[PDB]
Amino acid sequence: MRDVLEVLEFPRVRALLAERAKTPLGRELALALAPLPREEAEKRHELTGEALSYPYALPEAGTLREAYGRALAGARLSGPELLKAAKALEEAMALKEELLPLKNALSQVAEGIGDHTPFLERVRKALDEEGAVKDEASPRLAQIRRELRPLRQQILDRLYALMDDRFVTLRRERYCVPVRAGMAQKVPGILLDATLFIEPFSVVKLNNRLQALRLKEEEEVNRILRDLSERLAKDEGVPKTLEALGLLDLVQAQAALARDLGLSRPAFGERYELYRAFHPLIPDAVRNSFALDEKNRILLISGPNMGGKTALLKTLGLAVLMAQSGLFVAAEKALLAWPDRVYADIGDQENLSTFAGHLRRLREMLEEATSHSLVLIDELGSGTDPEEGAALSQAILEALLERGVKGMVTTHLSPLKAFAQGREGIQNASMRFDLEALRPTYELVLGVPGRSYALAIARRLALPEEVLKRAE
Template identity: 35%
Template sequence: MPSISTSPTEEPRRGEDAVAPESPRHTDENSLQQLEFPKIVEKLASLLATPFGVKELARMEFAADPQAVREALDEVVEMAGLLDGGYPVPLGGLNDIRPHLERIKPENAYLEVEALLEIKSNLQAMGELAHFFREHKDETPRLAAYARGIHYHRNIVQEIDATVDPGQPEGIYDRATPELREIRIKIRSLEAEQAKALRQVQKRYAEYSQDEIVTLRDGRMVLGILPNFVQKVSGIVHGTSGSGATVFVEPMETLQLSNQVQNLKIRERTEIIKILRFLAGLVREVREDLYFGIRNIAMLDFIHAKARLAREMNAAAPQITERAHLKIANGRHPLLALKMGPGRVVPLSLELGTDFTTLLVTGPNAGGKTVAMKTIGLLLLMARAGMLIPADPDSEIPLLSNVLVDIGDRQSLEQDLSTFSAHIVRLRDILEKADERTLVLLDEIGTGTDPREGSALAIAILSELAEKNILTIATTHHGELKAFAHQHPRVENGSMEFNLETLEPTYRLRIGVPGSSYAVEIARRYGLPEPLIQQARRHVGAAKDKLEALIIDLDARIQELEKKNRELSIKITEAEGMRSLYRRQSEELKRSKQALKQQAAEEAQRILQDANALIERTVKEIRQSGADKSAIKAAREAVQAQKEQVEAILAAPETAPEAESPLLIKGDVVWIESLGEEGELLEDAQDKTKVRVQVGNVKLNLDAAGLRKLSKQPSESRVIRTVTGEQVDARREGVKPELDLRGMDSQEAVEATDRYLDQALEEGWEEVRIVHGKGTGVLRRRINEFLSRDKRVEEKRLGKWGEGDTGVTVVRLRKDSH
């Protein structure tokens, strides 16, 4: 990645005044309008945070260089990582100071106080922004490169702070210069003398005064005199009040003092201009550097807007390829994702450019054909413009040089063109411009004229595009085109799924299956008389009716197979879960058996030790008693009691207590022969080979023949702790300082993180890594939200360059939280 120099004479990577490289071929304006790309641009504009980003947005290009596109996408991924991690970028508080910078270009130019304060505020905001990216340079190296071109210029801020204050006269401190201080001292002294003299004059003219008014007019102190008595006051008239009830007169007695004050104020303004020129000169010295910083801020703002847009759409960075191969995995229409939320938009998946280059999509009206086609065009344009797309990160976007579109009614009254003629003119232009580096999108090809002739033209056009290996997606209702797509080796059928029970579209795109228009079926549903329906079928013709019927029957079979496939997938998942559960339970039983053996060995050792101690004690007592009969008898009885205790332990059954009754009903406590455990029956066992049993926190399906009823009642207080295989492995191998959440959904990931933090604290780890991957950013946001609220977390940050970047969150744990 090229670095950004901090020299004001060098340009940023995409500077405002830089000479733009020769632009690649752009998508024409008609195509942009028909795909509604300007609406994406409008949304981006609404997300800009500074006045500088607007110009950068206006300069947006559809890049042709793969490395440039990948770098632009990586920049957005870095910015989105900051936002997902809860680090808001400080782009606020920036005003457009470029007019001020332009105004001080001449050597003697100066700025007024308000402009200087705006510059100071911007410098402070620029310093904060640069500091922010220095703090995050490890996880955002690309963005930090822009920030290195943004400078604070502390000396200018300090000079303005020491000189300018809106609360001071003329906005400048007295201490700004010794000359200004001296002038203002004289002004205040003369104004005090003037006010004293004016009060004395006012007493003399009190009977002529209007409420003893003393005010300023044009910077001079004047008296308010009643109009009828103006001639009685010696002085200079400076005007009247708005109502004419007061005439403002400056008495001759204060005129000389007033003249002196005015002369000093002129000197004051001259001194202030010198100060303002000095400050403007400081700014002028770094003017080019400020322009340079503004251009870098504009780029950061532009990237920030793209990251905010990506978060709203749940977007990810696709793979960029130079070959003409398009792969969309779970792509969603960007504008629909913004309007409805990404979770409510039906995704589409397709691959174009490997087995076939042309996809012909059929299906009913309002079934989503045009939306699907627009989705593909918009995703390609967004990726070329350096925007993340609402699709899975394994999607592949080719850097095609052009997207040519013909969508909608192109009737032109001004050019005297009918709808069909306008389409033909557009198709002619597309055929002239299209090459193997072009994506062509054609909506309702061949419509607007005789269906047979329109179909023939459509087949000819699609054949031409397919022979040139031009990636093409077209929609149609013509049945002849379905057969053409089936026979041509570079063309494939596709269709929008239609629910045959409700006769409503599902908006799912299916590849390899032609669709029906379902016109007759929809007409029947909406109440057209059955005789008309049958007559329509006869007019369609037996062959075509039979073909449509075959398509509908095939559609029904496919939907039924997909339904069964989904059900089978659920059952397979359940079976895998049960197998995993049984495996863990088996491991638990093995460990329990080993523990019991150990316990039995320890018990036997204790009994042996007690027996040896008893024998030694007995022998000692016999010797001490001189073989007294009563002592011998007592010793024999003690040894016999110990022997009976051992025999009772050895004779204890290994299986469950004898069952009271063979009849098992719901709620019974049973002994499970195969597990050697107690459980509670969850259903009546009569006439059943398998029944559900609650064992601890686990529900199992077990053979009824292997269960024996016990006399005890279920114990509510008995808690069996279930230990998962993962937990056992963690205890056996030790908890590692890293948790990999990739492949989990948000809820599973949060639960796994919650358990892992406890284990990590028990293991003694102070810092751990949570691997959530980059992907769409959903998992990263969810995990960071959870960590932000968790009291076990001291601090967290995104991974540094080489640590996993934004795909990893590094967590420091509180030592006292365990």
């Protein structure tokens, strides 16, 4: 289900991916990315590589979507709100003509970008660069504008007989002048705290036939803006265009992730072989390279935690899940097969109700894992009795080697190190320690178990030499 994407911190990979979307359309798709059918995932891989090859820009799709959705509901869209949507459609078509001569997988997506010309040429006639509605837009408005602009110069007009302050302003959307202490008639807008904002008697009557022509201004503009909105809504090209951008935004981010982290195109075969692989979320991550195949199914990692043990289990699993999701994956080169189910046993320490939780996941593996399934097991046999737990831990390893699963196990149990020798299909490996430098490395040593650390600490630490006392 989930609980494998959760365990492997896949949503953090989604979080990084959506940070590199340029629209919410891409952002949403990244936040719901998940393992795909194999043809889709490779097609996402091929798309990602080619968007590395030729970068492209995007509209603000999503402002386009939000305007279009409001049009479908039958909002009366704002002028610039139409204009901003109109430009995004215009850039979407322009991107399509940019992308088609590439004649490759980017172009095939871009073929979904519609012909939005009839909406555009409506818009370019209708409204100007600022989103206000032109005189051109209907003839009915043009007569209104022709009867309005000259009337607005009355009042121009501007009488003196001064003593008044300055200017001409309009209050309550009717023209007026400021005056102090006079002797000039009529009907006051507001007052000061001197101004008194006068609305002379002479120019009341032809104020109302400017308010009248104002009410016709909206009554023909709010006809036009609605009609432009319905022309946007009744444009069947926009979904298939919006679908196309959300890919192109997502596939832009699925590549810009790989540029930014060091990710690569995997290929799918019948066995895993990673070349300098690492955890995407670990900064400056140490690069390591292994291979699991039908001869060497299960890789048993013997470990001074905290020196790499759990990160590799997440490193393998996260590369596979990103691969199945169409993401580029965290290697110099990656060859992974395609498990029917990943099984992850990883914690959230280490006594004995961790161990029950470890058993609870392993039982799920023991019942319904096939030879095609990939198993990650952390802290096998720890948290519990080292004697009885060792026999159980071998008992579960035998169950899965006979089962033909592939995957990776981390354990501390020395009786399990002796078991990975001499038993076909499981192999030992460890994590290096510069015990001289008193650090983990975090390299990986294939073939070599987590051999002996404890004495060599002591000599650097100035313990008595009457001790040691070495049994062996």
